[model samples]
Target: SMSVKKPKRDDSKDLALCSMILTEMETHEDAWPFLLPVNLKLVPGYKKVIKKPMDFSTIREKLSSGQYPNLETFALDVRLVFDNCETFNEDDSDIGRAGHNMRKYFEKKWTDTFK
Candidate 1:
């Protein structure tokens, strides 16, 4: 496991990093499916497909409310979006490609920004 270089990071720093990274994801082209919660009517069986569905808008609110106790916790939520997308669609499809690209973008930023 990687160790923290500093003793501990401040909470405000966590908020800032989450917010900045989130905005980047939100603005990205592949961010469409994850911009908000999936519509039950639009995508049938989504509830059954994804038990703990997550999206950028919800993550924004959670970030604002400080739902993430740390950067590690916040990362899971971001990854969850990609994971669900991967499960629900084919990699060759439109949304599927987006998920892969977005996930790649996120991991790159994660390593550069958080690691």
Candidate 2:
């Protein structure tokens, strides 16, 4: 008998994952300063910490409207953001701990999702 693999979930449509990452980015303010462009902050209804249902809707809007070739690219880029923090942050300091934790979060998620 042959085993069949489940198709990987598309992160673009994965509201849970996208919202979680966005929320995390907002929480760790330092992360997005380098992660996203200054124009992203200027977008209407784009709050630091999404406040209401309306705020959540903007995520999908950006998802469909943004120039990303695919959601996989988006996922990879976000992962790289954490990697940058992990590599650049002072390893023995409090800020480093936050970066370490964020990197680990994405690593675990990636492993669980794709491995």
Candidate 3:
């Protein structure tokens, strides 16, 4: 099967996914609309949980406290969300406005890591 679907990790695709997840889940209510899609389609059900979205906020807090269970898991999820957000074109400006803090958080971390 010579399919044209060659999925590789490009820079923009990586950033887009990270940006999309943070933007979508910055609030509790905003996350409600996306549970099924994110869990069932974007990320596997056992891997992605609504509570994880809730718990993700504690990344910094946990890191600051020097209590990371799995830094690899954290990093992988960050990159995955960035890769999964390629279709969020219309919500770009709105995302920046609403989730500016979280965006800054991830962007700073991403840049520091990849740079």
Candidate 4:
């Protein structure tokens, strides 16, 4: 008899990584996930909200407290982060390549989750 193997789980979908990436996207002014600080220091660009910068702890709290409202909102926020990454980093830079990889990962995840 032939048997199929179960697929391994993707740990990148965990809240910590998502929160980290989200915060990094929002806070960093340039190349990120490098030797930079781990916590967020400011909001992304002008047109900024008069709100505290997002970080892992804040993400966890907001998510657990139901402050986010919905997953679509979360998706939108993630997109904002990606847009910021796209705006500041060159397509060939380290952070740019990293962000591009991140974009591909999320795109695959979105396709898989929705399908």
Model 1 vs. true fold: TM? 0.88
After superposing candidate 1, which stretches have Cα over 4 Å from the reference? 1-6, 9-12
lDDT of each: 0.89, 0.53, 0.44, 0.53
Error of 4 at 59 (Å): 3.9
Q: State TM-scores per candidate.
A: 0.88, 0.46, 0.28, 0.51
- Order of candidate numbers by lDDT, starting with the best: 1, 4, 2, 3
Winner on lDDT between 1 and 3 is 1
Instruction: Estimate, for each residue in 44-105, the C-alpha lDDT of model 2 and write its tens digit.
Output: 54344333222213443465576446657656656555454455457777756766776676
Candidate 3 backbone collisions, by pair? 17-81, 17-82, 18-81, 18-82
Considering TM-score, where higher is better, how would the candidates rank from best to worst?
A: 1, 4, 2, 3
- Candidate 1 or 2, higher lDDT? 1
Per-residue lDDT tens digits for candidate 4, residues 1-115, read 2697688665444554445545554454443442232334553452343232322344455666767755566666555555656666689988778767766666666555544
The all-Cα superposition gives candidate 1 an RMSD in Å to the true structure of: 3.8
In angstroms, the error of model 3 at 54 is 12
lDDT of 2: 0.53
lDDT value, residue 58 of candidate 3: 49
